[PDB]
Structure 1
């Protein structure tokens, strides 16, 4: 449940703090983005001495959502905050460290490099 005009936190060490959602990729007139769904965002907050600068246009992936997500076995996963990780074209992280846990659905969507650096894959 992430759409246009929606703000997420960044779980990298790229220097970004808030991003605003712009578009949800995967088809025309798409509505929501869940865990493992790529988006297009813009940087709203940043650290003074970082790489990404305020006002950039970047791509990102969703790793945590407040909305519960149903799994194939009838179980559910829920967090307290929406978070995102900025990636590049090859679907690899731009940063080097990942903060906090991430969902297991990134394994299905072939985000093998993000899963390795994540402290916990719930």
Structure 2
């Protein structure tokens, strides 16, 4: 989520129920990841038959944090719960459904599939 060992819910469709960040991607001593950032997860808990299994090093986009994300007027938007959407090596989502809201910082060229499925 924000840092390593952080544990975070799963906002997309199939597989995991809880994932834990094992690496914040990006820079070198990079220590935090907010909404729109890419982390490296492992699947701590999953459903009985889904597209991911428990114990699996995967990549996920951070969609929904408690620290929140700030707008240009100074306003913040701040959620009750940490959540990510798991991705493949295309950095395309695996599930076909998104649960919960997302923010408009995520409707970029790579993550607008998550936005177009979300009930924002």
- Into which bin does the TM-score normalised by the smaller protein fall? over 0.9
| Distance in 1 separating the partners of 2:53 and 2:113 | 24
Deviation larger for 106-115 or 42-51: 106-115
Mapping 1:1-122, distance limit 5 Å:
2-108=2-108, 110-120=110-120
Tell me if the contact between 1:21 and 1:41 (Cα under 8 Å) persists in the aligned partners: yes
Deviation of 1:71 after TM superposition, in Å, equals 1.4
Cα RMSD (Å): 1.3
Query: Gapped runs of 5+ residues in structure 2?
Result: none
Deviation of 1:90 after TM superposition, in Å, equals 2.4
TM-score of the superposed pair, with normalisation by structure 2? 0.93
Deviation of 1:50 after TM superposition, in Å, equals 1.5
Query: Gapped runs of 5+ residues in structure 1?
Result: none
Deviation of 1:67 after TM superposition, in Å, equals 0.9
Deviation of 1:54 after TM superposition, in Å, equals 0.5
How many residue pairs were aligned? 120
TM-score of the superposed pair, with normalisation by structure 1? 0.92
Distance 1:9 1:68, change over 3 A: same
Tell me if the contact between 2:11 and 2:85 (Cα under 8 Å) persists in the aligned partners: yes
